[PDB]
Ligand binder design. Structure first.
Ligand SMILES: O=c1ccn([C@H]2C[C@H](O)[C@@H](CO)O2)c(=O)[nH]1
Ligand SMILES: O=c1ccn([C@H]2C[C@H](O)[C@@H](CO)O2)c(=O)[nH]1
Ligand SMILES: O=c1ccn([C@H]2C[C@H](O)[C@@H](CO)O2)c(=O)[nH]1
Ligand SMILES: [Cl-]
Ligand SMILES: [Mg+2]
Ligand SMILES: [Mg+2]
Lengths: 143, 130, 140
């Protein structure tokens, strides 16, 4: 009942779809891409969207992206804000190749979902927090 | 209170626990694992789960996973689909080693939480955005 | 609106809202050699609103600008990480020789309601069909 408007780069793009057993929706390479080991490439995904107001999208690799295509996503998880909704606001997957690789036009290389943006907040500067330190970075150990 | 049903691989798995100061729950290597520099391995986590209706899980490394074990998680954040709830649907951590490393059975290498899935959405194709 | 309390490491930290992710900055100059790791201190400590965690990822431009990836992918700031010396960091692995400058925006965060109290019930048998995983749906 919530609507996402999607505009494809052109008629040759493979239209994306929801599968029953996929909680996120797979996105696809807009063209063939060859990447060399230890080299980078913004893979075009060939979609621009208008998300429901107050929502954002998150894009991450699929668990099989590394096995299939030998790339990692350099920004970890991509955030697409509701405002990135213009007629030429296409989506890109930033890929770093850990081995030589070829991605084919139409290949499902990552996945996305939408969720509400964070609530309105204000940052209030203080001089002192007055809380006990938790610690971090492996303070609880490993065993 | 919601229930997560957890089935372990075997009785040698260290049962997982929520700690007071951990908003996400730590998952553990199901066996000893060796990974050489610049190689990949799916680290078994030894758990299969049924999440409450309408929920997915997300998995990320601990901030100390890299320092302690020299690995990154190749899919950045794993998404455990709600349907991944069968008796053979055991969870895994996709590790790429940036140096030679050893992980031991029971070591806490990543963490998880649950979240409501994206609702049903309608994908409406348009020729132009407004 | 919800309040976040923020304490800066010192007076030299660059000071930082309608729902967008919030940019965080390096607290000092950082030099990282190719194929080496460095915590980048972010010079901030915070007390988030009751019941909230924070999530930290790189900015879209971080790789282009600095040649680093975030080793834990998305950092989770636990609500209890609110002490006077609980300063946030960005765990960075350099894929090239790089210099990060004090005050440079390098990652971004938002808050989110933490997972509520859940009961973990061990069972002997799930009784559902297997979905399969790790690329069970293929690529085409
Ligand atoms: O992984 C990403 C992250 C962001 N964007 C879009 C939305 C964002 O506003 C713009 C600038 O980063 O690019 C992408 O295409 N891919
Ligand atoms: O990091 C991950 C990602 C996925 N899976 C499983 C669950 C998911 O439903 C399926 C395909 O992504 O494989 C994992 O065990 N770990
Ligand atoms: O990327 C990260 C991840 C974690 N932490 C802190 C907050 C958290 O509660 C603690 C343990 O992960 O370390 C950071 O500052 N940055
Ligand atoms: Cl998030
Ligand atoms: Mg999938
Ligand atoms: Mg922890």
């Amino acid at each position: 009942t919530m609507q996402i408007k999607i505009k494809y780069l052109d008629e040759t793009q493979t239209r994306i779809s929801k599968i029953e057993q996929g909680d996120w929706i797979d996105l696809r390479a807009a063209e063939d891409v060859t990447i060399k080991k230890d080299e980078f490439k913004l893979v075009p995904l060939g979609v621009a969207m208008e998300l429901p107001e107050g929502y954002e999208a998150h894009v991450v690799p699929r668990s099989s992206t590394y096995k299939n295509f030998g790339v990692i996503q350099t920004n970890s998880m991509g955030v697409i804000d509701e405002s990135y909704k213009g007629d030429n606001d296409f989506w890109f997957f930033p890929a770093y190749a850990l081995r030589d690789t070829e991605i084919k036009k139409g290949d499902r290389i990552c996945q996305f979902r939408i969720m509400k943006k964070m609530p309105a907040v204000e940052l209030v500067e203080v001089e002192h927090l007055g809380n006990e330190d938790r610690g971090g970075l492996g303070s609880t150990g490993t065993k």
